[PDB]
Amino acid sequence: SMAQSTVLPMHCLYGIFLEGNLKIQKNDQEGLKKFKDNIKKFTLELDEIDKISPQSRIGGAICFSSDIWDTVTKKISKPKELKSVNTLSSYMPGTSQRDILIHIISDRMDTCFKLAQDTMRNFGEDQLDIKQEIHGFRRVEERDLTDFIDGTENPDGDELRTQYGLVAAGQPNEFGSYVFTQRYVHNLKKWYPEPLSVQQDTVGRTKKDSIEIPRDKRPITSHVSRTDLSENGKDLKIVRQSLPYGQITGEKGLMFIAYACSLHNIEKQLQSMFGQLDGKHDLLLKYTTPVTGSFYFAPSKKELLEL
Amino acid sequence: SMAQSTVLPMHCLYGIFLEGNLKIQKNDQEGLKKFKDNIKKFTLELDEIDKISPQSRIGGAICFSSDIWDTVTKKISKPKELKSVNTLSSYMPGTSQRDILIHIISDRMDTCFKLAQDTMRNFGEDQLDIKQEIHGFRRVEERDLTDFIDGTENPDGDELRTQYGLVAAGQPNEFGSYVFTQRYVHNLKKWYPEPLSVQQDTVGRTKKDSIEIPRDKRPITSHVSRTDLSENGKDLKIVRQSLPYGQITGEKGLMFIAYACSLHNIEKQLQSMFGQLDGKHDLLLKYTTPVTGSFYFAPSKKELLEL
Numbered sequence: 001s002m003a004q005s006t007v008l009p010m011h012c013l014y015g016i017f018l019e020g021n022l023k024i025q026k027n028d029q030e031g032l033k034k035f036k037d038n039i040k041k042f043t044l045e046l047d048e049i050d051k052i053s054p055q056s057r058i059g060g061a062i063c064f065s066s067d068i069w070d071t072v073t074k075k076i077s078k079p080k081e082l083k084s085v086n087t088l089s090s091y092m093p094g095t096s097q098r099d100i101l102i103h104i105i106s107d108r109m110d111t112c113f114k115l116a117q118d119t120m121r122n123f124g125e126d127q128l129d130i131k132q133e134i135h136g137f138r139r140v141e142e143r144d145l146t147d148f149i150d151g152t153e154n155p156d157g158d159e160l161r162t163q164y165g166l167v168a169a170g171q172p173n174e175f176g177s178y179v180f181t182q183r184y185v186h187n188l189k190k191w192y193p194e195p196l197s198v199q200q201d202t203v204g205r206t207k208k209d210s211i212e213i214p215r216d217k218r219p220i221t222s223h224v225s226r227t228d229l230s231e232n233g234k235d236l237k238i239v240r241q242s243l244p245y246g247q248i249t250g251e252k253g254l255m256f257i258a259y260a261c262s263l264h265n266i267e268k269q270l271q272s273m274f275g276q277l278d279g280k281h282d283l284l285l286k287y288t289t290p291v292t293g294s295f296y297f298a299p300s301k302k303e304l305l306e307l
Numbered sequence: 308s309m310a311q312s313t314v315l316p317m318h319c320l321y322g323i324f325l326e327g328n329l330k331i332q333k334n335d336q337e338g339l340k341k342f343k344d345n346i347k348k349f350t351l352e353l354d355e356i357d358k359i360s361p362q363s364r365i366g367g368a369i370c371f372s373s374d375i376w377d378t379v380t381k382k383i384s385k386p387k388e389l390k391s392v393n394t395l396s397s398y399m400p401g402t403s404q405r406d407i408l409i410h411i412i413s414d415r416m417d418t419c420f421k422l423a424q425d426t427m428r429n430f431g432e433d434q435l436d437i438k439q440e441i442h443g444f445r446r447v448e449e450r451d452l453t454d455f456i457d458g459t460e461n462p463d464g465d466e467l468r469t470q471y472g473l474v475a476a477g478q479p480n481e482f483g484s485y486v487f488t489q490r491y492v493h494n495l496k497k498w499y500p501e502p503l504s505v506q507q508d509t510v511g512r513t514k515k516d517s518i519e520i521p522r523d524k525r526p527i528t529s530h531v532s533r534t535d536l537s538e539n540g541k542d543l544k545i546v547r548q549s550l551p552y553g554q555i556t557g558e559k560g561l562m563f564i565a566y567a568c569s570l571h572n573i574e575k576q577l578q579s580m581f582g583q584l585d586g587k588h589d590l591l592l593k594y595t596t597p598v599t600g601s602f603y604f605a606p607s608k609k610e611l612l613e614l
């Protein structure tokens with residue numbers, strides 16, 4: 001009946017991203033029982049935080065890779081499109097498929113961090129080998145560190161975000177979501193001196209107001225031209241929850257994350273951006289570099305608790 | 308005349324700490340004029356953020372070391388007590404005296420970060436060599452990562468925080484503040500297994516409600532017994548603005564910062580904690596370690612603009 005709580009809500013101010021590998025082996029029934037109790041604790045603490053701090057608009061999801069699926073469940077069918085993002089390594093840099101993603105969103109860092117910290121203490125280092133912990137935060141005017149607004153054409157509202165973000169009702173794994181994460185490191189030393197016309201050509205929208213540059217006036221390699229894709233007259237939209245991260249005086253960029261009803265909607269955009277559809281690359285990739293990457297599936301709340 | 312805006316306000320949810328060295332040489336008059344124009348831009352942007360985002364309760368201060376004082380001004384007398392923290396290196400680990408501190412506080416990360424980033428871009432790499440950038444955040448119930456409440460006996464309200472936090476009216480450098488920063492790295496694996504009785508003996512207050520343990524029933528090396536000091540019947544109080552920082556699965560701790568009307572109020576507590584008064588160390592130092600340290604002076608708003 002219900003999805004996990006990171007897909008439909010919009011405009012979170014904070015996000016914590018924990019990605020890593022499961023240390024419990026396939027035959028360890030007691031370890032897997034403890035693992036699933038820690039999953040239940042996560043869902044219970046989400047509800048408790050929502051009750052105590054409604055202003056947080058808290059959300060959270062636990063998501064699983066195709067390689068770990070048969071370790072964590074023998075009951076739930078593996079989502080039919082799920083595969084390792086490492087299969088894209090021949091053309092997309094930075095792939096680093098992990099077993100598990102925990103994504104937590106909030107309008108307050110204190111409750112975002114509380115849920116993240118309590119969850120990591122529950123699972124513990126003996127269950128999860130955490131490879132990446134990212135503290136994302138929204139900036140003024142929802143701008144990415146390129147200083148373009150990020151989110152203008154993100155689908156709005158529960159109806160469209162259910163349509164594009166969640167597996168359809170009646171289908172196997174209904175109300176789950178395919179998930180893609182990818183940490184980008186921005187080269188702002190290179191980007192900042194670029195003329196405004198170059199920056200707008202690169203993105204495909206105007207910088208101040210995020211007005212779309214007419215298709216016939218912007219490069220086919222502009223970011224918007226690379227990612228605004230359709231098949232059979234139907235748009236391949238996705239639900240993005242990306243946030244800025246990092247140090248002003250150090251490494252910084254965009255922690256990209258997308259949720260989708262079909263992995264194909266995400267993968268086709270990756271083929272477009274990274275040169276597999278027409279041999280051409282996204283202009284944005286001259287200024288930013290992906291350094292991690294993973295595909296997951298976030299089960300419905302029911303299937304999460306029935307693994 | 309008024310102070311810079313990080314001393315009197317309480318209970319900030321976010322703080323950014325930027326510490327580093329001045330690249331402008333004492334002979335470079337045009338570079339120093341540009342440096343002071345960037346100081347002016349900082350004060351103006353604080354006012355503008357305050358107007359646009361009253362909910363941020365924005366605050367900020369630029370602070371100067373004794374070593375850099377006569378580079379940045381030949382007009383304002385050097386504060387009488389200002390000295391390098393490296394003079395404490397014989398007994399206090401982690402000293403790392405820098406020329407400049409910029410401390411920004413907010414109840415929203417987006418405006419905290421906007422002011423910090425805009426300021427760093429104004430000064431630029433040509434003027435500042437940043438050695439440390441810390442993103443502090445308040446946790447639930449204002450608890451330090453030891454999970455004790457941090458702030459119970461901090462002076463409350465404008466009157467007491469002016470008395471203890473700011474140089475007294477009529478004195479040289481009136482309404483400025485002596486500043487001490489010190490980044491701690493916590494060893495929570497050593498702390499978590501201690502029984503509550505040991506944790507409470509270590510701090511000197513109860514954990515759940517921060518009730519003071521009577522002085523004759525706690526060790527003289529408890530943190531409260533080390534820092535609740537007096538001379539001549541006057542309490543050596545300070546104004547703390549410390550915040551947690553760091554990664555759940557990595558390095559984390561407390562970004563300590565104190566403001567005081569007199570550097571001696573801070574230094575006597577450091578002598579106490581680090582064994583220099585009676586040969587005994589603060590019990591808290593079994594569980595956390597300072598890895599940076601600096602003394603500065605935050606001028607009054609008037610003296611900041613008249614450097």
Ligand code: HEM
Pocket residue numbers: 144146148149150151152153154182184203205210223224227228229238254256258266269270284288
């Ligand atoms: C450095 C990384 C990236 C940055 C800075 C970035 C930034 C942006 C910006 C500024 C926009 C325009 C405003 C908007 O409609 O949201 C945008 C649009 C979009 N981005 Fe990205 N993006 C990045 C990576 C990605 C990736 C990896 C994907 C796909 C997997 C993606 C998918 C999209 C989509 C679907 C749109 C909306 C296109 C439309 O229908 O008009 N982006 N991005």
Ligand code: HEM
Pocket residue numbers: 451453455456457458459460461489491510512517530531534535536545561563565573576577591595
């Ligand atoms: C890891 C570093 C530290 C931690 C976790 C820590 C934590 C705490 C806690 C839990 C309290 C009790 C609640 C309160 O009244 O605020 C406290 C009190 C205090 N701390 Fe610290 N503290 C640290 C470092 C320092 C340092 C370096 C100083 C001095 C330079 C300092 C000065 C004080 C003072 C003055 C008090 C109030 C004592 C009183 O009058 O009752 N602390 N600290």
Ligand SMILES: COc1ccc(CO)cc1OC
Pocket residue numbers: 045048049052053111114447448
């Ligand atoms: C789940 O417990 C909490 C969640 C959020 C807050 C914020 O006040 C406090 C909580 O426990 C004290």
Ligand SMILES: COc1ccc(CO)cc1OC
Pocket residue numbers: 248249250427428430431432435436437
């Ligand atoms: C590495 O030092 C810096 C990097 C970036 C900025 C502003 O974008 C400022 C820096 O130092 C002042």
Ligand SMILES: COc1ccc(CO)cc1OC
Pocket residue numbers: 140141355356359360418
């Ligand atoms: C566009 O400039 C601003 C927008 C929002 C804020 C705080 O929300 C501050 C701004 O400029 C200081």
Ligand SMILES: COc1ccc(CO)cc1OC
Pocket residue numbers: 120121123124125126128129130555556557
């Ligand atoms: C290094 O990995 C961890 C460190 C600390 C915690 C919770 O305290 C969890 C970790 O991994 C799950």
